[PDB]
RNA sequence: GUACGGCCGCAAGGUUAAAACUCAAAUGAAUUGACGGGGGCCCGCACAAGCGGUGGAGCAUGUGGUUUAAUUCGAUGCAACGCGAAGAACCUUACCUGGUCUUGACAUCCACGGAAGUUUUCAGAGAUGAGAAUGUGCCUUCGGGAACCGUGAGACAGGUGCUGCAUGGCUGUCGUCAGCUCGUGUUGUGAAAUGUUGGGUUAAGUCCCGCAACGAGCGCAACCCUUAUCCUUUGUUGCCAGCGGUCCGGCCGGGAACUCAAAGGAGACUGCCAGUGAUAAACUGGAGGAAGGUGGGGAUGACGUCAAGUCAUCAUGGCCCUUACGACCAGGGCUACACACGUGCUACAAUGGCGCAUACAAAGAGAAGCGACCUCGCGAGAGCAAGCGGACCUCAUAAAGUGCGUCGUAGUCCGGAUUGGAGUCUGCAACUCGACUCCAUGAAGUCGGAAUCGCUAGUAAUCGUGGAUCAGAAUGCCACGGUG
RNA sequence: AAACGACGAAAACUACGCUUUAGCAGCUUAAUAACCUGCUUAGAGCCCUCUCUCCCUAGCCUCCGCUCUUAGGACGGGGAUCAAGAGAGGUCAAACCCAAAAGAGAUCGCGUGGAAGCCCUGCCUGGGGUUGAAGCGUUAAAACUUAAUCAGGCUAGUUUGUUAGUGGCGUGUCCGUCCGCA
């Protein structure tokens, strides 16, 4: 829960949902072969020079409630320490221990 | 640390939860930190009134606020406008349209936290400490309740060495899955530290579950 | 019970028997714990019995040591060492190297000014400096307001820095082992004892009897979750018992007998007959029964022990740094190494590998998604791309099995690692550092000392599939069924 | 190495308190009693807050969003005070709570048939596309249509290719007869 860490995961959030347009439009031209040579250096040159940290695929998943870098669980977007407390007082609708 | 938390073991048999209403692994954590953050508003907004339970509920894109207290005269306020002034600023914190209700407890010293308070407030006042485990006893069996366990940890009295002390009236069963057992925990704040105080109470043997 | 003194005795010594000086104790009977190289009884894959494995050999993370700039923090006998870490190329993550800072990257606050803002131009790898093209978004008395930026400090920040010998919370072990206590009464002047002990019995302080014990709490079981026979309800995306057309496909016409779907129940309780046992509890057979003695599996971990482990999920009383331990991004290193170790995968080849018909599962995940087809590629997957918050579509022709062939005991058509190159998935980028692919070299190894570990039934052992972490990166983790 | 035990016998909100009534229970031979208790309700002592008993008015409402307007009901608007009684409650209000509207009906918002910019086209002529830029129409309509017309001074003869003077710091700081770009 720090800090300092707190902070470039949502820039990492504020930025990467800015360039959502050009960077799926570049992709997609990049990725279809029926281009030209210069055109794709020319874009992959521009994506490249954009701010680094920006990037989808560079951000960890972090915890919503304690930032824990490790176990963010997508279901409840917490980590084991703290569903395991939220779960056990009661506020997941329908969280109970289980025996198969 | 030995013992099993009973909330998270009694929750699908007799006692209700606190949230269900319906998501679908997208908003729940922002659920679950709406939940939270109005809890401890309502907790430093109602820090005198007497209050055990908020349970929460969200029927379609609508949240709803149910509180269980014992003093819902400061909360109304004169005329009856304060509870809708803070509905106000709940409906803010929340985002969503926001409606609260209030659940008065008659005769509430078998609620958890209700009867785990005034006695953290005793030790803040200095009052002795003895005194207040012995009233909190004494207060917790003249209700009709069959046994309450209240775990007191850390400087007792305001002492200087945590230790660790607890008593035991009646009969508070952990082991059967049938037995009411509402538990909860606080925290007083001293001149000196901090103390732990958990509670558990044995309403007694419910048979049928939950359909009352 | 010593010296002197008297007596006795050959002697050893015996006998009578002090004083000076030190201390506030020296003791005996009994009780509770503890301890014994004291004894007895009982229990658990604890031994035995078995059956498979680990030390022998590629490889994988993990551990100690070494090197290194760092080889990022803690865990250190059971009870740390495939641990946190449910997946370290940069980001990452706290470590290292260069450069920017100062109420700071992120929190409330005043004097005001600009709507916030969108595209690009440039110097620098970057850290962030200059700036232009621009927008004036809704509103009171216009000594303007919310929202967002900008500056000036001071009221403030920040710390994954330490202290788990201040702690809360949490967890593991003893240990699902069976004990740990209390009320009253009784006994002994009393500390204290009884209950809790003793025989049967059990998984048990489980049940019975006797006994100054009688009862109660935490406790052992049950109440909680599934499986095992049967009943009813609802019949779609499912079934075709019977009937019909039929493109031979349940396609529908139909239906709710069934398998399945989720809701409520009957139901195994020593209930029985016989023996044993104390005319008990119980144990053993047998009968019915789908199941029999707890019917079969899982959570539930009793007072307490380990200054047990984490101030590195988090909070936290004190020290602490306040122009740096706070903070800035880029490149490295957490992945390295003459080594030793826990664990597992992979193999030793005739029950075994090579290929060609061919079969039966459960449960799952799916919209920045799951992703049928098709055109292709020796292969990874490329392009085009239907359907679907799903009893509808995908992941997903499961294998072991089976019938054939084939090889013939050989470093092997075993074993699949190292190597040069080739593309592919993937995320801005795989020299450090991914995985997949297939052509090519085709290592080691041929059941492995002393030791040593796991299992008592649908379990060992084998075979495949599924799930979470995440741009991809599982021999690790958690589940699922088949054989047996 | 350490570890004492003293005073809710200095009841710390009254939850309005304050009064009182039946039973229960801890107490023990069985009971009572204090209260040790909570616990169903009774009534008013006693401070209370709100809607009231005042009058005026017939207010009044609700499906269509507006309306004279329709069975109807629990429906109900202003002004000073309260004499004594009556409902609630206790620093009491949203939700819980009890059942709703009959029709007419302009229809404003909401969708227009001949045209102003963007399509060869960076100034601008494009009827071949169009917008509320023009007739118009109810809980809806008299339907109706942002792309494909060749081509112009369309960045303007010197910017595209011959080529020419000095309205140039040219060059290691350089004055330097000069090499070389316009
Ligand atoms: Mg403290
Ligand atoms: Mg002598
Ligand atoms: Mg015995
Ligand atoms: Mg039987
Ligand atoms: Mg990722």
């Known amino acids: 829960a720090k800090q300092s860490m707190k902070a470039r995961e949502v820039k990492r959030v504020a930025l990467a949902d800015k360039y959502f347009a050009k960077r799926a439009e570049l992709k997609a031209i990049i990725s279809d072969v029926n ?4 055109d794709r250096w020319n874009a992959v040159l521009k994506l490249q020079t954009l701010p680094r940290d920006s990037s989808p695929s560079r951000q960890r998943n972090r915890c919503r409630q304690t930032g824990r870098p490790h176990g963010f669980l997508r279901k409840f977007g917490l980590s084991r320490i703290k569903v395991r407390e939220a779960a056990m007082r009661g506020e997941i609708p329908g969280l109970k221990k289980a025996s198969w | 640390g030995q ?16 949230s269900t209403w319906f998501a679908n692994t997208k908003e729940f954590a922002d659920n679950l930190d709406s939940d939270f953050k109005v809890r401890q508003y309502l907790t430093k907004e109602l820090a005198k009134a007497s209050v055990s339970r908020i349970v929460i509920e969200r029927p379609a894109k609508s949240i709803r606020v149910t509180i269980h207290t014992a003093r819902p005269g400061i909360v109304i306020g004169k005329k009856g406008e304060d509870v809708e002034k803070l509905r106000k600023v709940v409906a803010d914190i929340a985002g969503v349209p926001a409606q609260i209700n ?32 012995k009233r909190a006893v004494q207060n917790a069996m003249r209700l009709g309740a069959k046994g309450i366990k209240v775990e007191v940890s850390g400087r007792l009295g305001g002492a200087e060495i945590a230790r660790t002390e607890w008593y035991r009236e009646g009969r508070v069963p952990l082991h059967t899955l049938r037995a ?29 579950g939950m359909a009352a």
């Open chain 2, 102 to 133: 209030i659940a008065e407890v008659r005769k509430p010293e078998l609620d958890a936290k209700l009867v785990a308070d005034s006695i953290t407030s005793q030790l803040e006042r200095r009052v002795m400490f003895r005194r207040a485990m």
């Open chain 2, 180 to 208: 009411d057992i509402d538990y909860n925990t606080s925290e007083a704040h001293t001149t000196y530290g901090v103390i732990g105080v958990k509670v558990w109470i044995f309403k007694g043997e419910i048979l049928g």
């Open chain 2, 3 to 18: 013992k099993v938390h009973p909330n998270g073991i009694r929750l699908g048999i007799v006692k209700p939860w606190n």
């Open chain 1, 35 to 38: 281009a030209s040579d210069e």
